[PDB]
Amino acid sequence: LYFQGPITIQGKEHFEGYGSVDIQSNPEDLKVSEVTRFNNKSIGKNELTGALQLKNKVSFKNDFEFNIRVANNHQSVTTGADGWGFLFSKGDGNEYLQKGGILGPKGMENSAGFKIDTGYNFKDPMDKEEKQAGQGFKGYGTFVKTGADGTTAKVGTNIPTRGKADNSFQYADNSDTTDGKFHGQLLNNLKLAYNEKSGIMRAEYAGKIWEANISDLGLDKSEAYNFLITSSQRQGTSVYANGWMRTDLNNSTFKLTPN
Ligand SMILES: [Ca+2]
Ligand SMILES: [Ca+2]
Ligand code: NA
Ligand SMILES: [Zn+2]
Ligand SMILES: [Zn+2]
Ligand SMILES: [Zn+2]
């Protein structure tokens, strides 16, 4: 008798791309062989948007751990990309293209995930709560859920080393040696970990930690969800490499039980 156990997969062949997603070979600044690039290819729309949909549905009956290497654009919070949305949903890549994800005020309904927010959108009440308005590289991370009507809301919390919870961090810098600590314009690991026993999804990035319960995210233990890596950018605000959000899927790892 045969039962599907955990798998660990790596590489872009396990994802289908949607919208503004393309390949960049041997990017000189990132020092790896290939990245998947968001917000470069045109899609005939002012709002560039793109998604990588994992071809396997993710079973929440079992643990998973995603280690996703991402690099952020070296660009102002008012010029660059909206950010990264790591998204779980019954919807698919085509629905995301039409309704959005978790990086703005509204998105695909009944979905949830973790966002690295790198852009200031005056229409998003979350960007105002986080004092995102600025001209540098200050962004924030948080788990996010959309309701039945599509509205995004914060879920869970930062787990600070000391003091008060804080979502903010610098998503890029003008460091002056980029070897050692966190420099968000380089490839850095985002760990997305889920423990089916505790019901907790944990995100680790930029030396910070966030947690949310799947009950508060609106995900059910017994369901299986599509997993999407997304980014978007509003054009016309900037310019070479403008808005580029890149991930190295060849050295990213995804451990899960497919379903
Ligand atoms: Ca939907
Ligand atoms: Ca934002
Ligand atoms: Na790098
Ligand atoms: Zn493979
Ligand atoms: Zn720059
Ligand atoms: Zn709602």
Q: What DSSP assignment string belongs to the chain?
A: ------EEE-SGGGEEEEESEEEEES-TTTTSSEEEEES-S--SSSEEEEEEEESSPEETTS-EEEEEEEE--SS-TTTS--EEEEEEESS-HHHHHHH--SSSSB-STT-EEEEEE-S--TT-HHHHHTT--SSSSEEEEEEEEE-TT-BEEEESEE--SSSS---EEESS------SSS--TTS-EEEEEEEETTTTEEEEEETTEEEEEEHHHHT--TT-EEEEEEEEEEESS---TTTT-EEE-TTS-EEEE-B-
Judge whether 199 and 214 are in contact, CB under 8 Å: yes
CA–CA dist 5, 108 (Å, integer): 30
Residue 156: closest CA among 207, 198, 101: 198
30 CA distance to ligand 3 middle (Å):
4
Judge whether 225 and 52 are in contact, CB under 8 Å: no
179 CA distance to ligand 2 middle (Å):
28
Say which amino acid occupies 127: D
| Resolution, Å (one decimal) | 1.9
191: left (phi > 0), else alpha (psi -120 to 50), else beta?
A: beta
Judge whether 92 and 226 are in contact, CB under 8 Å: yes
**Alpha-carbon dihedral 248, 251, 256, 259, rounded to 10 degrees:** 50
| Sign of the alpha-carbon dihedral angle for 163, 167, 168, 173 | positive
Instruction: Please list the residues that pair with 54 across neighbouring strands.
Output: 15
Q: Which ligand is nearest to the CA of 13?
A: 4
| CB < 8 Å & 24+ apart, contacts of 122-126 | 124/152, 126/152, 126/154
Residue 206: closest CA among 166, 154, 246: 166
Instruction: Please list the residues that pair with 24 across neighbouring strands.
Output: 35
CA–CA dist 211, 246 (Å, integer): 24
Q: 10 Å Cβ neighbour count for 66?
A: 22
Judge whether 87 and 102 are in contact, CB under 8 Å: yes
CA–CA dist 11, 23 (Å, integer): 12
46 CA distance to ligand 4 middle (Å):
34
How would you label 155-168 residue by residue, b for 16+ Cβ within 10 Å and e otherwise?
bbebeeeeeeeebb
CA–CA dist 230, 251 (Å, integer): 18
CA–CA dist 95, 87 (Å, integer): 12
Instruction: Domains for the chain: give ranges and CATH numbers.
Output: 7-256 (2.60.120.200)
5 CA distance to ligand 2 middle (Å):
38
Whole-angstrom Cα Rg for the chain = 17
| Residue found by looking up tokens 């369901």 in the block | 223
For 124, phi then psi, to 5°, come to -105, 110
197: left (phi > 0), else alpha (psi -120 to 50), else beta?
A: alpha
1 CA distance to ligand 3 middle (Å):
44
Q: Which residues fall within 8 angstroms of residue 61, CB to CB, at 6 or more apart? A: 196, 221, 222, 224, 257, 259
| CB < 8 Å & 24+ apart, contacts of 132-138 | 132/77, 133/77, 134/77, 134/78, 135/76, 135/77, 135/78, 136/76, 136/77, 136/170, 137/74, 137/76, 137/77, 137/170, 137/171, 137/172, 137/173, 137/184, 138/77, 138/168, 138/169, 138/170, 138/171
| Sign of the alpha-carbon dihedral angle for 58, 210, 77, 28 | negative
**Which method resolved this structure?**
X-ray
Residue 109: closest CA among 150, 155, 151: 150
Q: Which ligand is nearest to the CA of 152?
A: 6
Instruction: Please list the residues that pair with 245 across neighbouring strands.
Output: 38
110 CA distance to ligand 1 middle (Å):
7
CA 203 to chain CA centroid, Å, is 10
